[PDB]
Amino acid sequence: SELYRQSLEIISRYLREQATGAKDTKPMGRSGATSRKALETLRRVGDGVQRNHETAFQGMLRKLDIKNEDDVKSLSRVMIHVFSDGVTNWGRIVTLISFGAFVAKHLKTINQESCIEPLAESITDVLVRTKRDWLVKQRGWDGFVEFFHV
Numbered sequence: 001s002e003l004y005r006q007s008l009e010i011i012s013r014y015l016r017e018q019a020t021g022a023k024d025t026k027p028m029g030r031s032g033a034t035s036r037k038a039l040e041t042l043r044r045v046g047d048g049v050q051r052n053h054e055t056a057f058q059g060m061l062r063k064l065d066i067k068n069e070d071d072v073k074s075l076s077r078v079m080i081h082v083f084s085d086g087v088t089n090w091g092r093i094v095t096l097i098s099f100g101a102f103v104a105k106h107l108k109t110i111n112q113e114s115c116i117e118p119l120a121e122s123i124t125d126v127l128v129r130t131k132r133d134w135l136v137k138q139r140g141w142d143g144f145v146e147f148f149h150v
């Protein structure tokens with residue numbers, strides 16, 4: 001669907017920019033203004049989450065103990081568990097994606113950057129496939145952008 005593809009583009013762009021520090025100039029495409037606004041929202045709100053929850057993020061990264069691609073496969077089990085537990089909302093979705101960026105930065109640091117794209121795919125899979133009903137009900141990325149109104 002466009003929801004999956006839109007979500008993948010936003011999340012992948014955010015993780016790549018976080019990991020590399022570089023901004024992608026290629027147009028978003030279909031939901032341009034909204035996708036661009038969603039990415040900007042992740043930049044601002046996600047920075048806040050990474051900073052304000054740095055202690056937990058650093059501790060979690062240590063727990064995952066990522067050395068290679070095999071460890072990146074193993075964290076998908078943890079991701080789907082922790083995220084699926086309890087009630088979802090945009091705050092938890094930002095935590096999911098912001099932590100993804102935090103992990104992606106680590107992957108850059110250890111020179112295993114090729115895992116960033118599959119990680120973004122994994123995050124998108126868990127978000128869109130498992131919470132489709134909630135996302136649709138809450139107006140998808142339009143809803144996300146309006147909720148935070150950065």
Ligand SMILES: Cc1ccnc(-n2ccnc2)c1-c1cccc2c(CCCOc3cccc4ccccc34)c(C(=O)O)n(CC(=O)N3CCNCC3)c12
Nearest residue numbers: 053056057060075078079082083092095096099100103123
């Ligand atoms: C597990 C944990 C324990 C204590 N404090 C935490 N933490 C994170 C920020 N502040 C605390 C967290 C915590 C750490 C990292 C992410 C989250 C999330 C988002 C969904 C899970 O995301 C991932 C898990 C594993 C690997 C991943 C790799 C890439 C991207 C995402 C990954 C949550 C959540 O869904 O709420 N939590 C739990 C959390 O925030 N809690 C705090 C209060 N008590 C336990 C629940 C994560």
Ligand SMILES: [Zn+2]
Nearest residue numbers: 052053054056
């Ligand atoms: Zn926290």
Ligand SMILES: [Zn+2]
Nearest residue numbers: 052053055056
């Ligand atoms: Zn806490």
